[PDB]
Amino acid sequence: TQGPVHLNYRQKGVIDVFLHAWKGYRKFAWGHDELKPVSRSFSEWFGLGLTLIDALDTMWILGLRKEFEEARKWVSKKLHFEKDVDVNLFESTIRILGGLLSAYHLSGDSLFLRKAEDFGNRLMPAFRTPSKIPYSDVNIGTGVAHPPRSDSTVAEVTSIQLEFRELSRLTGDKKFQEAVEKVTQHIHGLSGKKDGLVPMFINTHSGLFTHLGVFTLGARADSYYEYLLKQWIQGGKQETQLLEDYVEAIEGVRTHLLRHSEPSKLTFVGELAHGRFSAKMDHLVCFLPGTLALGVYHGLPASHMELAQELMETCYQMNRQMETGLSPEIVHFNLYPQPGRRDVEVKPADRHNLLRPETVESLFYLYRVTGDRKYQDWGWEILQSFSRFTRVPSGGYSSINNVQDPQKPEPRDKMESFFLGETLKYLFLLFSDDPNLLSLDAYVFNTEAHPLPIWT
Numbered sequence: 001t002q003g004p005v006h007l008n009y010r011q012k013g014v015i016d017v018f019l020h021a022w023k024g025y026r027k028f029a030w031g032h033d034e035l036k037p038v039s040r041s042f043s044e045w046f047g048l049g050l051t052l053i054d055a056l057d058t059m060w061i062l063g064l065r066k067e068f069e070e071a072r073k074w075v076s077k078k079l080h081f082e083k084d085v086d087v088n089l090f091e092s093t094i095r096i097l098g099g100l101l102s103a104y105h106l107s108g109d110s111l112f113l114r115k116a117e118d119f120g121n122r123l124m125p126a127f128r129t130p131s132k133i134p135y136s137d138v139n140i141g142t143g144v145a146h147p148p149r150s151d152s153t154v155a156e157v158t159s160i161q162l163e164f165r166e167l168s169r170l171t172g173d174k175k176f177q178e179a180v181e182k183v184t185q186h187i188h189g190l191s192g193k194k195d196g197l198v199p200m201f202i203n204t205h206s207g208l209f210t211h212l213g214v215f216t217l218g219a220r221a222d223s224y225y226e227y228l229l230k231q232w233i234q235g236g237k238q239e240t241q242l243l244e245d246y247v248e249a250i251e252g253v254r255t256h257l258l259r260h261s262e263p264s265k266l267t268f269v270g271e272l273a274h275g276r277f278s279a280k281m282d283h284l285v286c287f288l289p290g291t292l293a294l295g296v297y298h299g300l301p302a303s304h305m306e307l308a309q310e311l312m313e314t315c316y317q318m319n320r321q322m323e324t325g326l327s328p329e330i331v332h333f334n335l336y337p338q339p340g341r342r343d344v345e346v347k348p349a350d351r352h353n354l355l356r357p358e359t360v361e362s363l364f365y366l367y368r369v370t371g372d373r374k375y376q377d378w379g380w381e382i383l384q385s386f387s388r389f390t391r392v393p394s395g396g397y398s399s400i401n402n403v404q405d406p407q408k409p410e411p412r413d414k415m416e417s418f419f420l421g422e423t424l425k426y427l428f429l430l431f432s433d434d435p436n437l438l439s440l441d442a443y444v445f446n447t448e449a450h451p452l453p454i455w456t
């Protein structure tokens with residue numbers, strides 16, 4: 001129960017929260033996908049030690065080597081992909097493949113690469129479709145892929161590129177990169193976009209966008225825009241088509257989904273359905289200011305910076321207007337002049353908070369790019385809310401049902417893997433005053449906070 005002396009107090013705090021969280025996992029869900037902190041149990045989604053894998057690079061970065069070594073032992077002896085189980089190509093890629101690739105790079109342990117290549121190969125069946133656009137699911141054990149319980153979601157097939165490309169680079173096996181790039185290239189020419197904005201679904205057989213006319217930057221589309229830029233940065237900034245699509249998409253966001261609340265004029269991104277704008281914004285969308293700032297660092301328009309700063313402020317407010325200080329799953333904004341009206345509105349069904357990272361993720365980028373200490377302060381405040389309302393005494397942290405009630409937040413008895421894989425990682429990195437720690441010049445984070453090296 002002692003941490004390194006060099007660490008500033010905020011990073012130590014993050015480490016203290018991690019240990020408490022890791023504690024519950026070690027005692028009640030060791031080797032299992034997700035922890036059930038409240039009931040001191042666990043749940044299985046893939047049965048591949050999701051949380052352990054998703055937290056490998058986080059432990060390494062926080063200097064929790066003893067913990068890392070123990071988790072490394074489990075991967076070495078308990079992780080088996082020879083299982084008859086269906087997995088989502090996207091969720092598997094960003095957490096498992098990305099998680100292993102990061103672990104391999106930070107630790108240098110070839111074990112993680114071996115597992116990654118193994119897993120990468122078991123995921124390939126998913127691309128066996130008429131259009132080459134991948135099926136949503138794939139049984140890693142039997143080798144057969146298939147659509148969900150129809151179509152595939154656009155974000156899902158366009159948010160697996162960084163991982164597959166890197167695996168090809170490290171293994172020399174080009175099939176991973178090729179499959180994944182074919183998808184990106186096909187999406188590039190595909191019509192049905194509204195000034196860069198892509199629809200939520202795409203048919204694996206016809207390879208065409210479906211559910212036309214409905215656009216959103218939240219679930220089902222979000223990371224698509226994120227990976228346009230990140231792939232660009234990953235490839236040494238030479239794949240200009242990615243860049244072009246990205247800047248077009250941003251302008252498209254400005255022109256069709258960007259609005260301002262009343263009476264405070266909070267900048268926010270809403271959803272568009274067949275011409276009808278909806279002042280609705282998923283917390284998921286809070287990744288945008290982060291990606292926006294990232295691009296600015298890499299030479300994108302200064303107008304992108306203002307947008308980033310504005311949206312960072314809004315996402316911050318999305319958390320702070322809540323009684324617990326934690327943002328709800330979805331936030332509606334008031335759009336028309338009404339005196340005593342609040343800017344932020346939240347429907348009862350959306351008052352949940354699953355310890356998502358999007359806000360702290362973007363604060364990290366905003367600070368790295370602006371150097372403005374207030375973003376660190378904001379992150380510190382959010383960590384406090386997590387500690388005060390989501391902490392489980394016996395160990396771990398839990399998602400909650402009521403983000404608006406500090407006396408009865410209502411734990412849902414579940415700790416998402418992205419909490420240790422992302423939320424605490426970004427917070428640790430946010431509180432760092434060393435620009436050389438996973439520099440924006442050398443590394444690029446996949447959509448699950450797993451850092452991958454920028455190529456030369």
Ligand SMILES: OC[C@H]1NC[C@@H](O)[C@@H](O)[C@@H]1O
Binds near residue numbers: 094357358447
């Ligand atoms: O809130 C985060 C959750 N969904 C979006 C993904 O890109 C990843 O960040 C995590 O799976």
Ligand SMILES: [Ca+2]
Binds near residue numbers: 287448
């Ligand atoms: Ca993400």
